């Protein structure tokens, strides 16, 4: 599969929402981007699943836990995703 990474300068918000996880048993995924903003710009699409955060496989972290570590992030958000969006 067809991986990209993002380094989004903060500070937050960082424009977008998740969904999934382990408590949904299915991967997190980008769900909703803000217009204009930094997700969005940075060329993340609705769809693509999240590998990693910072370094941290994110594939079985519950949502909280993917959610507390992108908001635990200071000064850039760096994450690793997965194409998902190429119909």
């Not at 990474?5 to 969904?19: C, D, H, I, K, M």
Request: hydrophobic share 35%; charged share 15%; proline share 3%.
């Amino acid at each position: 599969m067809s991986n990209y990474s993002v380094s989004l300068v903060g500070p937050a918000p960082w424009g977008f929402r998740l969904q999934g996880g382990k408590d949904f048993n299915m991967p997190l995924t980008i769900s909703s981007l803000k217009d204009g903003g930094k997700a969005a710009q940075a060329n993340v699409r609705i769809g693509d699943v999240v590998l990693s955060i910072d370094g941290i496989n994110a594939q079985g972290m519950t949502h909280l836990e993917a959610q507390n570590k992108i908001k635990g992030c200071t000064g850039s958000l760096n994450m690793t995703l997965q194409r998902e969006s190429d119909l």
